[PDB]
Amino acid sequence: PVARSWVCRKTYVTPRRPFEKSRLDQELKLIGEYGLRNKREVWRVKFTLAKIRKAARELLTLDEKDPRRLFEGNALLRRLVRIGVLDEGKMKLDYILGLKIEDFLERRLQTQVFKLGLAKSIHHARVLIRQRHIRVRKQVVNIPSFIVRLDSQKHIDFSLRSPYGGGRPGRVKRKNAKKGQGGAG
Amino acid sequence: KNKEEAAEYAKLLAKRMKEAKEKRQEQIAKRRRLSSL
Amino acid sequence: TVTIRTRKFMTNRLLQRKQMVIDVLHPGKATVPKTEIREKLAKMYKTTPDVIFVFGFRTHFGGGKTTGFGMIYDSLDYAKKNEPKHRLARHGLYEKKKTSRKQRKERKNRMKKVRGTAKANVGA
Amino acid sequence: ARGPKKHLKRVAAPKHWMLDKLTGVFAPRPSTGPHKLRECLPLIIFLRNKLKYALTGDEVKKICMQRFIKIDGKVRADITYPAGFMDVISIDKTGENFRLIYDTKGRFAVHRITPEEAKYKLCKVRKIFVGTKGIPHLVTHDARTIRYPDPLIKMNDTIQIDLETGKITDFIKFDTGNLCMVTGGANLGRIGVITNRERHPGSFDVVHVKDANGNSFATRLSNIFVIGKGNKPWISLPRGKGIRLTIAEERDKRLAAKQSSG
RNA sequence: UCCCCUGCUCGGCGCCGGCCCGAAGCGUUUACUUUGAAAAAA
RNA sequence: UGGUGACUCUAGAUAACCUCGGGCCGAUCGCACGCCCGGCGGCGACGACCCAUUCGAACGUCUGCCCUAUCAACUUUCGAUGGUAGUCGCCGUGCCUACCAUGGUGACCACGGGUGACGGGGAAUCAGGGUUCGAUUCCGGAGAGGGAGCCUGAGAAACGGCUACCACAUCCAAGGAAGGCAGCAGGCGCGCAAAU
RNA sequence: AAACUGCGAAUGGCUCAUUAAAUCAGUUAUGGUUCCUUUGGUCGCUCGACUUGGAUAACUGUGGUAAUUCU
């Protein structure tokens, strides 16, 4: 009777058709456009979008003017406004189902780093996050699948320990300085 | 302590019995009034 | 430099000590040792530097914050009455026996194996 | 099981004990006392989770047998003593007293009270007994056998006892138009007025209780604690006065507090 | 979308032995349907 | 007197009983000090007949379990069904005795057999319905080779308690003596298959 | 320390062999009974010594069996 968690779930799903032309072309287009690593990421984004769509459909099939419908509908709309995939104009339950994988993919931290101008390419943004150069609200982030909120967009800048934004220079700078000192004598 | 609490309970029981007897006599008088009137 | 902002202060008259949470903000430095933060709590809370006990320091990601516990007692022997002994062993005010569990268990079983006066002599 | 149980698992604890999961295997099983296992609260749970005076299981023991805590006017040295409904707890040195009342949700709540209100305790009579030499007896909901009661105390009344002498000072009669609250079930902590009392021969006699704002609900006869005579309560009610705010008004109040706090 | 088309022994919301309101206590039984109680935690 | 929906309920009165293996009504211990003419006091610890409460346990009420007709009738003075009166049991009761009547279940599947059957909260897949699993951390039950019997104790038919049987097995001067890892580590066997 | 006395070892831990209205689940009842400990009550209600008795531990001394948490 040890005291552990024993709670876990799978965050992605595998399609029943492994070899189709249009599906593989679409996921390859998404991966090459937004600089992702493998198809497990877009599969997990499809999984969470399917979960959100299923929840919205389950709320829509329940009758109007009920407290549970209003509570979970307004909770879902406030949540998706807080992510930033919707605006206050389209604050409706039926407008949830007209979403796309694109709207969930624009809120990635890698996409925001490439879009604001910190990086030159989306893959350069990914490897720039991986070497701990990007911080937000005084906390460094080393992971590319970070979902930034709407209020957290304007806090994106370089870190206080990265040499790009002011700090100690890296390994190649000090080694080349020591090489220049050795060459100069 | 036993003697004091027994005396206090006897006094309280006597007062409540007197009040209940007065209310019973009032109800008997009310029955006599509704019988006459 | 490094500066200290105490958080969640409360007093405990039931046990004559003061509970608070200390967050250590050291931009550019490593993790602070417990002795030097004990001297900072001494020069901040106007008490002697041998009554304060600190533990539970946990660094954050990126190395800007380090939060943890720290306790200040009113007097030294009041701290000696009501405290776990291993923290006093960390702070050098206590000594504990260095006997392993299997030796003590074997000695107890061998003492159980005999009766009388010989129990006190079979186990050395 | 060949005998009584002496352990109690953490996930087998009642929910109103209000614990966590990933701390330990076991939970504090209380010592036997006036209150039931699923309806009481251990002293270690209160002192270690609510008041935050102690952090481990040894500090609670040191405070407990240091003779610092008094339970209904009597000092207790058991760390797992069952504390239940309106158990008056007192700290003599820092001058604080707490009254245990169920709040608007299904749990206990910390409620600091003045010492003048800490001298008495409202409690519910359970059954009426007759002793050996014709002595009437009362059995109270926290198992307080009281000799020679008032002749007008019936089965479901509420008496007020001074904690220094053990005698009855004043009482509340069970009748419609009295302030009442529920102890157990889906409803817990709601303060209301008794209106109807349906009698079913051979089963539970349900009642009907109306809130002060327009809500109504039905509970059983055993799930009744009478606390007032009319509208004025005889004890200090906790925050919100037990109104059972629904999820929409709770969300609106939390959003208003978040907007005002900034 | 609102209200109206089961009968009888004691009393409090009001008056001058006379009216209304309520109630100790009874009202052809089922399934179906809506509400309420309780229905351990994870 | 008091109460229940309802007592052969509690309380009251009369006449007795009160077991020698016997109901209680204190031949116990510590700290701080003492007032009033040797008597007299404060707070505790322990023990005790009874009463309620707490932890429960136990026996019962209603409903709900996988497959099989190449199992269609089953039980019945070796209790099966019920009645009377008792024994025993903490209590009701064929639980068991002595006497009576022939009863009781069954095609709406009793009975008999099988199960790679501990039961449930649950898990996997899943449009809507479903199918499969649940030895396994929380709840209840059963066992410590397998039947049988018992002391102590409030609570055990207890097995890290005892007593005999068989299977298996240790030491020995051969007279005897000593045990049950389906506890934690570990080893052998068994294995497709599982660690300090 | 030892030892007498009192209390606990009937809790916890492991397994699924037996068991197909049996176990178990929800719902009831003990007005058909026992309950360690805790809590509260009762503990000068009875009409009849300013502290009693002898046994055993631990201990001392002396022994047997090849051998035991044996005597």
TrEMBL record, chain C:
Keywords assigned by UniProt, alphabetized: Ribonucleoprotein, Ribosomal protein
Q: Where is the composition biased (Basic and acidic residues)?
A: 87-97
Q: Where is the signal peptide?
A: none
Q: Where is the composition biased (Basic residues)?
A: 98-116
Alphabetized InterPro entries for the sequence? eRP_eS24_sf, Ribosomal_eS24, Ribosomal_eS24_CS, Ribosomal_uL23/eL15/eS24_sf
Molecular functions (GO terms): structural constituent of ribosome
- Does the keyword Ribonucleoprotein feature in the UniProt annotation? yes
Q: Which Pfam families match?
A: Ribosomal_S24e
Q: Where is this region: Disordered?
A: 87-124
Please indicate if the UniProt record lists Cytoplasm as a keyword: no
- Gene Ontology annotations for the cellular component aspect, listed alphabetically: cytosolic small ribosomal subunit
One annotated GO biological process: translation
> What's the family?
Belongs to the eukaryotic ribosomal protein eS24 family.
Q: What is this protein called?
A: 40S ribosomal protein S24
Native species of this protein? Oryctolagus cuniculus (Rabbit)
